[PDB]
Amino acid sequence: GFIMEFAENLVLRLMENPEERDRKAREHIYEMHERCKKIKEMWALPIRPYGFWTFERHNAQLRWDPQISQVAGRRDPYDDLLEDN
Amino acid sequence: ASGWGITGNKGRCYDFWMDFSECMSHCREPKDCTLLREDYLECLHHSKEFQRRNRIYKEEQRKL
């Protein structure tokens, strides 16, 4: 053929779907705003959590001392006296 | 707090500390049993008893 009859549909192939572009734009806005709200919530967390000491890793002694309160140097004076019988 | 006494028996304040720690181990707010924390602290130094005896001596002194 001639030049323009091919350059026309060439440019038309080069250009994209606008419906896809609009859908992607509204989508991206939706999830970006949702993620923005999520990050805003995340930044509100205090440095020290409400539980803190309640956490099992932050006790480390309520389940260690009971198995140590029997060794010498930690016993209540009234433990060795009546342990004989 | 540690529980190792000088004489080799036990810390005189160890039981109070363990009671306070056990209360705090299942109490997400410290205000509910701050009484045990006060008991442990003044078991270390006997502040309140000394204040009371000071008041008694002041009542003795004011009779001048």
Side-chain angles (χ1 to χ4, degrees), chain A residues 53 59 62 65 73-75, chain B residues 2 8-9 14 18 24-25 27:
Chain A
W53 48 79
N59 275 337
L62 273 297
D65 271 29
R74 267 172 80 80
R75 323 203 45 178
Chain B
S2 65
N9 292 317
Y14 171 62
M18 201 55 108
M24 191 145 278
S25 165
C27 281

Side-chain angles (χ1 to χ4, degrees), chain B residues 4-32:
Chain B
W4 302 97
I6 301 299
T7 76
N9 292 317
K10 198 155 107 162
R12 64 141 192 271
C13 52
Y14 171 62
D15 43 358
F16 280 167
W17 157 260
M18 201 55 108
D19 303 348
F20 159 65
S21 176
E22 191 46 289
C23 184
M24 191 145 278
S25 165
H26 50 62
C27 281
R28 293 176 270 140
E29 69 275 16
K31 276 270 151 205
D32 50 39

Side-chain angles (χ1 to χ4, degrees), chain B residues 3-63:
Chain B
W4 302 97
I6 301 299
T7 76
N9 292 317
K10 198 155 107 162
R12 64 141 192 271
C13 52
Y14 171 62
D15 43 358
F16 280 167
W17 157 260
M18 201 55 108
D19 303 348
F20 159 65
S21 176
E22 191 46 289
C23 184
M24 191 145 278
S25 165
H26 50 62
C27 281
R28 293 176 270 140
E29 69 275 16
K31 276 270 151 205
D32 50 39
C33 65
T34 197
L35 289 183
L36 294 174
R37 172 184 184 284
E38 301 285 30
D39 268 340
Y40 164 75
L41 294 174
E42 61 86 20
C43 177
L44 281 180
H45 313 103
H46 315 294
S47 175
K48 305 215 309 282
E49 323 185 9
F50 290 173
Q51 300 262 341
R52 294 241 301 170
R53 307 217 192 123
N54 293 325
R55 301 203 77 232
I56 299 314
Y57 179 61
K58 295 293 172 66
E59 298 325 289
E60 279 317 280
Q61 277 316 90
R62 53 91 180 166
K63 286 189 183 294

Side-chain angles (χ1 to χ4, degrees), chain A residues 53-72:
Chain A
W53 48 79
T54 309
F55 295 148
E56 65 183 1
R57 54 151 291 171
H58 267 278
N59 275 337
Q61 200 184 352
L62 273 297
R63 47 192 194 274
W64 177 235
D65 271 29
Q67 293 179 356
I68 301 299
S69 292
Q70 281 321 94
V71 310

